[PDB]
Amino acid sequence: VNSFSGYLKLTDNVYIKNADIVEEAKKVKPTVVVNAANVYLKHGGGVAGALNKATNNAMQVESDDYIATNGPLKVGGSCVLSGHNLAKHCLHVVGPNVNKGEDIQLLKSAYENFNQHEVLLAPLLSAGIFGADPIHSLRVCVDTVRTNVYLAVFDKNLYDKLVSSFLEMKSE
Numbered sequence: 001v002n003s004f005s006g007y008l009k010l011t012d013n014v015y016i017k018n019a020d021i022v023e024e025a026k027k028v029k030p031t032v033v034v035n036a037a038n039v040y041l042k043h044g045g046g047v048a049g050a051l052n053k054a055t056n057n058a059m060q061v062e063s064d065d066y067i068a069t070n071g072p073l074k075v076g077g078s079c080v081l082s083g084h085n086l087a088k089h090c091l092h093v094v095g096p097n098v099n100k101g102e103d104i105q106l107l108k109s110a111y112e113n114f115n116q117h118e119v120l121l122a123p124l125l126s127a128g129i130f131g132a133d134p135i136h137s138l139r140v141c142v143d144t145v146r147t148n149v150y151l152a153v154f155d156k157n158l159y160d161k162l163v164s165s166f167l168e169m170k171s172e
């Protein structure tokens with residue numbers, strides 16, 4: 001468990017890899033895989049749908065049970081559900097949907113949830129369907145997270161641009 005391999009280390013606690021989060025989950029067997037969710041735990045495109053599909057939809061049924069009991073999450077909030085076959089647990093975190101003008105400042109709140117967990121395999125919250133700049137998502141992660149976060153970026157082109165943007169931002 002937690003056998004992460006082939007990451008580039010950006011800070012003492014932030015690692016990045018050009019990889020699909022589901023395939024990493026299957027290789028690594030993490031204690032915590034992070035889902036970039038919405039407040040209803042309705043897993044659409046993006047990481048949520050990729051993770052959900054890999055669980056043969058058990059993730060969405062569990063989420064439906066969670067929501068029926070406790071109601072929707074808040075933006076910036078989270079909940080720990082089961083990791084099924086991918087991880088021990090899945091951290092479901094709701095970043096701001098900047099497409100709907102939700103407060104980008106809640107991206108910081110979202111990443112805070114990471115600090116409740118020694119080690120996580122995570123994507124870049126709000127960076128796809130929710131419309132945030134991926135560079136900005138990385139900046140907020142490295143600035144907010146103090147635990148060990150292994151970031152999976154599947155698109156090689158985004159990953160190269162993200163590394164070169166981080167080198168610039170760290171050196172100023």
Ligand SMILES: Nc1ncnc2c1ncn2[C@@H]1O[C@H](COP(=O)(O)OP(=O)(O)OC[C@H]2O[C@@H](O)[C@H](O)[C@@H]2O)[C@@H](O)[C@H]1F
Nearest residue numbers: 020021036038044045046047048050123126127128129130
């Ligand atoms: N298989 C994969 N492995 C690794 N990285 C992947 C990936 N698939 C995508 N990414 C990238 O991960 C980041 C997060 O992007 P999104 O997955 O779209 O989450 P976001 O917070 O923007 O929106 C949440 C909403 O999306 C709905 O799925 C969810 O239910 C909610 O309504 C982006 O850089 C993607 F490019």
